[PDB]
Specification:
By secondary structure, the chain is α+β, with helices and mostly antiparallel strands. Strand 2 and strand 3 form a beta hairpin. The PDB classes it as transferase. The entry lists the keywords L, D-transpeptidase, transferase.
Length: about 500
């Protein structure tokens, strides 16, 4: 298959690189077979967009086409460049349209490594019009999220890009922890690395030999920006981020900017949990009506990025221990600690369909193998239940949901990856009250027995993974707990 254009030989390598020759030739024929990319500023603008996608590292497709474009350009093969650019712009338009629909597959469950379906007729009309007006640069901009949050990441990207290769000494210290009052060997590298993330360094005193008062606010601001405990102590967590290179920050800005294409913005009614920020928000009628900290899955039992809906609440839930938890976690402890089941208010039941309670005294524990244990565990409802007082049921293929917790001290931690995958909600009682108020449900008598409550209006729940974002006028960075930034960072 060869692109039917006079000024492209059938033997040209672009015939193997073009994903949609039929549509590309029609666009040219509709435009009198004129070149679309003869304005270098327009070529530059599209390569700069592809360079963001390339650095983000989620798309072998776009990386492959960018490398081919740059090669044709280095050789002044502008006719080939022209047709490959036009093909690649159709892929970009499809990417822009498809990201919010299926993009999880490109960022979290795989990569964008195969060509996409052609963009919509609306995109194809906007392209035809843009070609007529030589407004391709504006078209590309219109197919970015029209969202100040996205533009804040791209603005920082553009600032840092201009100083990417300036030498900045690493911050070094002799001891593991440096506290206010301690001598400092590397004050200048420290102040330069605070300045790199746009913190006000103008009141830091020059040539002071120790961690003085003038450094304390900037250090705590740096800690807060990176989600660290704001203890003022320059330890390994603080230094990891101080010593992050501009190249690595640019990778994080690019990947996080492109991830914004995935996430819904409608505030009709939505719940969003950002895993690596360990927080959540609930919007009703276009307003934030609830926010709280959360606990999320341990790195070995990760909370998946997913879309689901909140179908129902259980007030005073029991906990039906999943088979895998029973076998791997609990029964080994039961075998070694004859007070475990009483202490955790856990009953042995014949099965879910047959909740006959069996006294653990009636079982020969010596003979029990967790793997073959034929009964099930059910934790009684109450304030010490692992689900607390509230289960927020969000049915999905990974069996993830939201719940209250008796372990509320964990919300005081800066890093909150403690669960088996589920999301534990701080102020769960307030979340339930707000949900049920908005649904036109309220209990005149608060049950002290288990009660399942169907939502009348199902609420979309978006579990997202955003390690850089803009909020209250500043950028926030978070540790890549599930290693989804790892390929972009280059850190193996
Ligand atoms: C959520 O994590 C839940 C287990 C109950 C809550 C837990 N104790 C917590 O750590 O917050 N579900 C799962 O762990 C998934 C288990 C899966 N095998 C299943 O079928 O339920």
């Amino acid at each position: 298959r060869f692109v039917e254009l006079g000024w492209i030989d059938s033997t040209s390598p672009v015939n193997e690189q073009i994903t949609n020759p039929a549509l590309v030739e029609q666009i040219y024929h509709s435009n009198n077979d004129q070149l679309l990319w003869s304005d270098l500023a327009t070529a530059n603008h599209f390569e700069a967009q592809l360079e963001v996608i390339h650095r983000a590292s989620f798309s072998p497709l776009f990386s492959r086409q960018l490398f081919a474009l740059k090669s044709y350009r280095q050789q002044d093969r502008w006719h080939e460049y022209d047709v490959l650019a036009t093909d690649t712009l159709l892929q970009y338009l499809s990417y822009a349209e498809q990201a919010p629909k299926v993009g999880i597959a490109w960022f979290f469950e795989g990569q964008l490594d195969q060509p996409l379906a052609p963009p919509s007729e609306e995109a194809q009309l906007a392209l035809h019009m843009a070609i007529g007006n030589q407004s391709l640069a504006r078209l590309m901009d219109e197919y970015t999220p029209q969202d100040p949050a996205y533009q804040q990441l791209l603005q920082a990207y553009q600032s840092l890009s201009s100083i990417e290769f300036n030498e900045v000494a690493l911050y070094e210290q002799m001891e593991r922890l440096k506290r206010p009052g301690d001598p400092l060997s590397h004050r200048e590298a420290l102040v330069q690395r605070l300045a790199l993330v746009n913190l006000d360094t103008t009141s830091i005193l020059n040539d002071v030999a120790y961690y003085d008062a003038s450094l304390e606010k900037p250090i705590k601001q740096f800690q807060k920006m990176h989600g660290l405990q704001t203890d003022g102590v320059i330890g390994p967590q603080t230094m990891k981020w101080l010593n992050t290179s501009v190249t690595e920050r640019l990778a994080l800005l690019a990947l996080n900017a492109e991830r914004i294409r995935l996430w819904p913005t409608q505030q009709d009614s939505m719940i969003v949990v950002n895993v690596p920020g360990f927080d959540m928000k609930y919007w009703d009628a276009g307003r934030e009506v609830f926010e709280s900290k959360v606990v999320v899955g341990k790195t070995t039992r990760p909370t998946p990025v997913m879309n689901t809906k909140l179908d129902s609440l259980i007030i005073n839930p029991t906990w039906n221990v999943p088979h895998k938890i029973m076998v791997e976690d609990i029964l080994p402890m039961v075998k070694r600690d004859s007070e475990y089941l009483a202490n955790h208010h856990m009953e042995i039941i014949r099965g879910w369909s047959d909740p006959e309670v069996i006294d653990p005294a009636l079982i020969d524990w010596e003979a029990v193998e967790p793997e073959t244990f034929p009964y099930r565990l059910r934790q009684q409802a109450g304030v010490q239940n692992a689900l607390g007082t509230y289960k927020f049921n969000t049915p999905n293929s990974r069996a993830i949901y939201l719940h209250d917790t008796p372990s509320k001290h964990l919300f005081n931690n800066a890093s909150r990856a403690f669960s088996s995958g589920c999301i534990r909600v701080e102020n769960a009682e307030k979340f339930a009250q707000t949900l049920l108020a908005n649904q036109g449900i309220t209990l005149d008598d608060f049950p002290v027995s288990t009660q399942a409550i169907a939502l009348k209006k199902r609420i979309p729940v978006h579990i997202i993974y955003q390690t850089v974002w803009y909020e209250e006028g500043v950028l926030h960075y978070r540790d890549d707990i599930y290693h989804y930034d790892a390929l972009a960072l280059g850190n193996g």
